[PDB]
């Protein structure tokens, strides 16, 4: 696993083309996330 950029705890990937896209985030320490909810689902076929 790589290191955060010096002086940073994470990386934000900000969308700079696709106007509808929300952000993605990267952490470099497993201890910086807690898996609070397990969601079981199916994707639905559009009508």
């Amino acid at each position: 696993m790589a290191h955060s950029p010096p002086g940073h705890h994470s990386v934000t990937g900000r969308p700079s083309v696709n106007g509808l896209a929300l952000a993605e985030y990267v952490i470099y320490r497993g201890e910086q996330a807690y898996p609070e909810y397990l969601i079981t689902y199916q994707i639905m076929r559009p009508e």
Binding site: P5, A33, E36, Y37, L38
Partner: protein, 162 residues
């Protein structure tokens, strides 16, 4: 492992706010649905609360460290994570085995505000070969799992990117 899964009732305000964040963050993907399938919404089958004393104290311990390095600001988000290894994550927690070495921002653990983005990774990088049973990245039958995770960002490096 120490992990117990508590079923939330569909009547529970917690089930309802988690379902709304799942449904409201679906978007169209530039791959036209290649990795994650073609869909506008989900059928939510179950929401379970993940309870592990040891993994929670490991989280709050690191969260206090980050906040003390960032003017008492953890910069905590709720974000989606998709992985074939959710069973290992809920029992043993996140670690370097859940990193992506070839990710656009290097070997780290990736999270998304878009549930539909995390959906592209449930069956592997770019959807892998799709569901175990039908080898179908757009399977409407097989049950998928996502995590909705508490994530400490602290001071985040801003990358402008396509």
């Amino acid at each position: 492992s120490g992990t117990i899964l508590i079923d939330l009732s569909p009547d529970d305000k917690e089930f309802q706010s988690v379902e709304e964040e799942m449904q409201s963050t679906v978007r169209e993907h530039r791959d036209g649905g290649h990795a994650g399938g073609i869909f506008n919404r989900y059928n939510i089958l179950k929401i379970q609360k993940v309870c592990n004393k040891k993994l929670w104290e490991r989280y709050t311990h690191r969260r206090k460290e980050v906040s003390e390095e960032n003017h008492n600001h953890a910069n905590e988000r709720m974000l989606f994570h998709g992985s074939p290894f959710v069973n290992a994550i809920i029992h043993k927690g996140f670690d370097e085995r859940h990193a992506y070495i070839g990710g656009m921002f290097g070997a780290g653990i990736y999270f998304a505000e878009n549930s539909s983005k995390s959906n592209q990774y449930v069956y592997g990088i770019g959807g892998g070969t799709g569901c175990p049973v039908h080898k179908d990245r757009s399977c409407y039958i097989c049950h998928r799992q996502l995590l909705f995770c508490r994530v400490t960002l602290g001071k985040s490096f801003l990358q402008f990117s396509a």
